[model samples]
Target: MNNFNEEFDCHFLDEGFTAKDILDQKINEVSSSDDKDAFYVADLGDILKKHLRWLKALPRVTPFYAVKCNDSKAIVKTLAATRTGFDCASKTEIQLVQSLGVPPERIIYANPCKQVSQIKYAANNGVQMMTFDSEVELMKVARAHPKAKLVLRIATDVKFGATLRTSRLLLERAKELNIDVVGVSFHVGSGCTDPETFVQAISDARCVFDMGAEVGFSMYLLDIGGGFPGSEDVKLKFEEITGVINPALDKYFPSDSGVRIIAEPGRYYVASAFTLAVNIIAKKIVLEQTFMYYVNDGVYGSFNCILYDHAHVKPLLQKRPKPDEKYYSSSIWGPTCDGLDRIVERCDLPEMHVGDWMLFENMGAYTVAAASTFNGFQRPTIYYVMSGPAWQLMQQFQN
Candidate 1:
């Protein structure tokens, strides 16, 4: 089956229209005085419900919503409402989670590089645990707050992610400090493709656990750290991926260690929940050549993070331009003066024209948090839709 096959209910496509048609319909619904093309909407409540459902399904693995993912107050509040923990990486994040009334224990300061002020701030603000990757940090923490609890962050073998061997060295130094060494953490790798990375990571964690044990540190938590893959096509089948790691745990650490398992999944939880709908305003079609659709939203707005991380977001043609015929492979470029703002090189979509809309899925994770107002472009406005208990909470919070 094609990767874009409608897995989730494709209500927008079910009505015999492409993404452009539905979006244009929405655009036309607005009053004539308003700029129909000027707004962007997000179903945040729907996003929250999806996240909660995912969390519920993974009963054994506690999710610490990585705050750097989005940090939208609504997102944080909804996660907190589910009683999920927050993996805060800075003093500001610590304070933010605290402001939401999350217990200090539920907030893990996961930054490996610590500013002195941040250390003091986390200590004073009732943050019970933080992560450290070097001896300097151990000494710094010991000086700032001798009684603070810490997790030893091991660097993972995976590139663009932490490794466990190097992290164990850091853990060794922390073991000598007076600070509380309660657990060990390692990031398997961002967008990690190989499932064996998890197995290798767990093996690394076991070595660290043994090392910590030899040093008399009572390690009770194993943070697999955030790096879960988030792709409709590339990601492991939900059951298949979980099966890979869950059994590895049984083989390596077992359930008897009394160590609670935790994972920080940034993209996996929220990436698919959001989609960007851009209106095509111009098309440079030529004789015997592929057409190029110029969209209103550029690489600077909803797509900045993807470009920065050298990642690509798969674009799905929302409103089919000519529904009766097969779509051709085309490119979509942003309305930017700069030459680097093109979104896709070649995407299969129905023939489209000015004022038509195109939707890009899996855009929720890092896009908004890393967006810039470059070229005087305003940030897109967000809207929310909800389900389950999150809907009720969203309504009450708005009230």
Candidate 2:
């Protein structure tokens, strides 16, 4: 239950506010007390200005951060103190990015059907890079980590299924079991609105790096996974999808094709730096032309991205109306007793009550990573903010 918000330290960074003015001073000190649940603020300078706009718009890709999209240990310890890199898919997200001291060569295990005890817990934690697409996960990483370094998770929407001839037969069965096929990945899917599907997944990862150099494997990495669209009202915009991913990585993995590119980018660094506020906790008025409202977090907490990422989520009234107020038609449910919890059905808003307070914007991706706590209702409290130059780059992770 102590998930950050230690009054957001450093004396609230000298009260320079603005994360909606520290969420209107933490909703007037949680409506002057008795805490009716529903929380989350998180700004960390909007995840370090979206990682400095993804290193000034994809300066040759390298951002692993897909820790199941929103791991939130102070956003993975401020993206591992800005050295970023971590894609982790299990083994408790590779020990939550090696418990934040990070390195395991910055971490990647990107999950290509693992679990041979998480591939022997990523081969005893030296976390040898992973990701495979079969030949039975390359014979389970050649009997649990044959000096693992593999990567070949192809699929840029040929109906979202693998191929490039099943990644050239999983790089010819990871070169007949000596398993060390170093690189070539794909994903062009999640929220991906065709920037020519990353120019056809980098020309199908440069023809699977010429089929991993005809299976002699020396493919020097290229993982362009994640669909990169974490809101700014999408339809493709991360600088126009990196202006078609910087000329399709300058014509297929150039820079003398030494190819060490990387990217997993879960919700492009914390979807608009988290906002959710919730707490209306019960209201009714149904058929007088509907007005439901419930809240205190839902879809089993944190609006489970509106039932797992179809996410339309629009509710915004954290106090601000009354120009002769009269808006009503509303919907927003989720204090759950499951009538499928709902979260914003018809909308129009502004007549809220039952201790009003709604808010919710780009909710830092996958809303608390698929939140749950089902029928007893828990998970919500997050509250970390950082303003201006992202609180002066979060005081170098507070010393």
Candidate 3:
């Protein structure tokens, strides 16, 4: 058996075990030996596949893995080993990337509104690239780090109507302050389903590029900020979206345009790679019509993405029940006193008893990044695993 089988013991046959089998084996092992509340299994194979997909789809764009998505050290280390660039939003994030020996050039301080102290921290640490949207931020960067390479962040669509004029003013101020305006960046929105939005954003970035040049700055970079969906059930597939992006890039910022294109992809690389397994700690029958199942982890734990990012989480039972088992109206909740800590408000599920397990897939992105130890409940432990091919690729990077 390979290392993956030896590690998870799911009986990795030539055809491979289903995800259900792996979860069932893990659930059985954990419940029989210990009272572990909940945990995550990160499949490196899935992450590798995501990266390969990104490369195949958007070959012209370089991805700077967003640190705010999932700051797990293992994820960061693996990305660094693969020579992927990083998108850091804070001083600590910059420090974390640097700790992995990622040079400042390979990191973009992508947060548009940054604290003054954080600007100084990046300047002192030799991180030159950052983003800003307002004149106040422009002045702050000029005063704190005059030599820093700045990317003017603009908002696209009707929601950010003020962004067009704001970009013009910021560019004028940067010229007056002698700050280097090196590029333009914009975020269409997270979990965006519209591919035309990216096409339009790229068009807007070209306008900003022209504006920067008119202001006497040689803008050589275009940052297409993240809106790429990490989930498999996205309304628009990555390939479908990239199909729009590639043509737009060729039309506006082609190879001869002398512009360096980069993207901040937070969820795309890691989202599908993680699976969260929660142990059903308690259950209650509500009005003889609904079943309320409470699990160890909740909004305060790995499910924070549901509260913060408006993520719709779907639960799958670890083991399938017999055909005779009836399905009922059910709700999955977190182990917290607050009513706001509910996970799945409603779903049709088989009658789940205490000690049963349910797992959430595509959970590696923003879920754990913002988890807290509220109500004294511990965070879920994460276990990293790699399939045979993924393991070999990782070893090549290590060597």
Candidate 4:
């Protein structure tokens, strides 16, 4: 079964149609069946829009999308068709993207801390570019994949990255072990709060490149790793962050320097592209005033981002509220019995009933990517979609 379609098995959005039209279709189609489980309408065209914006803003840096965000085959295949590179966290991730006909050169083993066997696995698959942060990691790579083009990860105060002072000695260490060091990389922490953070990290990366040259290695790759915002509800807009990045790139690594820059953007490419429609399984009118609605997916399912990724979600009613519709205080819970599985702690929702559908936007990033099937509750079925113009772009991308 070719689940991986070349054009992607997306519901093509017609001239007058949109993703919401398909969302309405799926909701109506399932209403006749027993299963009214939650589902997603993923707009692949949104990913294309995000890509175009990224190209326009940060023309100096190419995006190696963080596959760990949303590994849906449809999303991955769509990105593959667009010719965007991938940031694979493991051998399995590498294989997932590679199986879609993506070349090893376009894939980076992104995680700094890795298993020796997986390093060997990259060697077997010809994925030469991987990240490392410590001495033992270099030895592991030296023994496992000696010819690997390793990117030295400078510390962003993470368990993975090495300190700028620490990286100098580490670079020399790689030279001794005959492990090739080709670049510097860093994640300025997830949910980046300040744009200046990229400026700081970029400056540090240039220092590493100079030190690498002094150590007899002319390093050129700079991975300004993931942390860009995906949705509009951010402190800094996408272009706002890029505004700080573009000048910093020219200042630190001039376009004439032949330095290749890339970023691992997880949520930026996906968060808003997915809209999750979860069904209200049960309802309770608490004390005849407040209400609680039980949903099919929770912290264990598509809402796991709430627990793991620190996401806060809100639900939108399928049936629009009347102009004078009375609103009441309400809470939403997951199907699981765990009290901590609550999705929304409190919100003013129009009195909705069981079997009603509630949609959540800005959910594409870390939601389903980290979803589970605990308590026998399966994940929402994702309906991948693309606009006709976007399909035309896909044909242009692949050809």
Per-residue CA lDDT of model 3 for 1-399, tens digit only, reads 123422233222123754445666677776665575687777766776777788789889989999999998878887887777999999999998899899999999998888999999999999999988888888898889999999988888643222767789888888889899999988876757668888888888999999999989999999997878887677787788888999999999989979999999989899888899998989999885789999999999899998788898999876667788888999999999998989998999998889888889989989989999999988787767666767566666556
**What is the lDDT ranking, best to worst?**
4, 3, 2, 1
TM-score of each: 0.84, 0.35, 0.92, 0.95
Best by lDDT: 4
Residue 99 alpha-carbon offset, candidate 3, angstroms: 0.7
Ranking by TM-score: 4, 3, 1, 2
Question: Which pairs of residues collide in model 3?
Answer: none
Preferred candidate (lDDT higher): 1 or 3: 3
TM-score (C-alpha) between model 1 and the true structure: 0.84
Q: Work out how many backbone clashes candidate 3 has.
A: 0
**lDDT string, candidate 2, 84-151, tens digits:** 78898889988877876887998988888877988898799898888877787788778889998888
Top-TM-score structure, candidate number:
4
Clashes within 3 Å, all models in order? 18, 0, 0, 1
Model 1 alpha-carbon drift over 4 Å, by segment:
1-25, 31-34, 38-40, 45-57, 158-169, 320-329, 388-399
Worst 10 residues of 3 by lDDT: 5-14
Give candidate 4's error at residue 75 in angstroms.
Answer: 1.3
RMSD of 4: 2.3
The CA lDDT of each predicted structure is 0.70, 0.79, 0.83, 0.87
